Amino acid sequence: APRSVDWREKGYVTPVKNQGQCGSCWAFSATGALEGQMFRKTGRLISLSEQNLVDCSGPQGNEGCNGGLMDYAFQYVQDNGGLDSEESYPYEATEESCKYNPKYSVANDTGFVDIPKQEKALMKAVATVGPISVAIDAGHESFLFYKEGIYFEPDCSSEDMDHGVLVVGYGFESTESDNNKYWLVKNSWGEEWGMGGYVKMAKDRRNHCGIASAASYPTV
Numbered sequence: 001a002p003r004s005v006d007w008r009e010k011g012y013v014t015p016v017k018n019q020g021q022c023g024s025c026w027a028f029s030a031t032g033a034l035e036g037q038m039f040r041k042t043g044r045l046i047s048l049s050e051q052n053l054v055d056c057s058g059p060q061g062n063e064g065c066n067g068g069l070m071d072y073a074f075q076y077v078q079d080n081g082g083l084d085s086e087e088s089y090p091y092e093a094t095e096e097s098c099k100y101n102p103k104y105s106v107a108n109d110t111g112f113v114d115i116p117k118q119e120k121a122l123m124k125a126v127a128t129v130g131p132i133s134v135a136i137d138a139g140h141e142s143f144l145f146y147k148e149g150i151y152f153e154p155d156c157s158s159e160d161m162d163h164g165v166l167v168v169g170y171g172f173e174s175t176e177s178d179n180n181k182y183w184l185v186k187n188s189w190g191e192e193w194g195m196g197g198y199v200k201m202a203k204d205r206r207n208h209c210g211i212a213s214a215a216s217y218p219t220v
Ligand SMILES: *C(=N)C1(NC(=O)[C@@H]2C[C@@H](S(=O)(=O)c3ccccc3Cl)CN2C(=O)C2(c3ccc(Cl)s3)CC2)CC1
Pocket: 019, 022, 023, 024, 025, 026, 061, 062, 063, 065, 066, 067, 068, 069, 070, 071, 134, 135, 136, 161, 162, 163, 164, 165, 214
């Protein structure tokens, strides 16, 4: 495999978005993964509607601005036969009645793949598939106030993930020091957070923060 991967370099990734004051991280993770797989299919990068997921995927198990699962979002797109563009169904950061309109659907999915709970399996998927939805433990002040460098939190959990994000690659920092690898992660907290909205999550450090515990992507 390559020593570093960055799917932004191939046009798979929309700019950083901001979920605002709604607990819709799961929806941004899911649209990021589906944006990448739709691009893999068609060669067209089209921003997808998180609002459509927030408002409409309750029957699949999601809970709007109070949380959800990326796999439930993928199941919704499959069940629903489509997902509207960001343009047609703009983001409001509040849960409303479903306004899905099939006229403006620009994406589909046929299922989803759950990667096994192994950083090696996650690496193979990132190297070959595209951006991957992942669950992480973001429940520490260190994450909230992250600015730069490889994020490592000694108290991070590999089981109590609480935040859905998107792995768009991996790499390493030049150093003689032990443990210099990271996952390149797109967050949904705007470019004002982290490294222009991204975080380098420690890689190959005992499944740090659970990044390989609930990784998945949609089939299209
Ligand atoms: C995002 N803004 C918030 N976080 C969530 O909605 C997260 C996203 C997933 S998770 O934590 O990434 C996850 C954990 C374990 C297995 C798979 C995943 Cl994808 C779930 N989540 C939650 O807050 C949970 C929910 C589980 C089922 C739901 Cl429906 S919501 C409590 C774990 C802050 C909202």
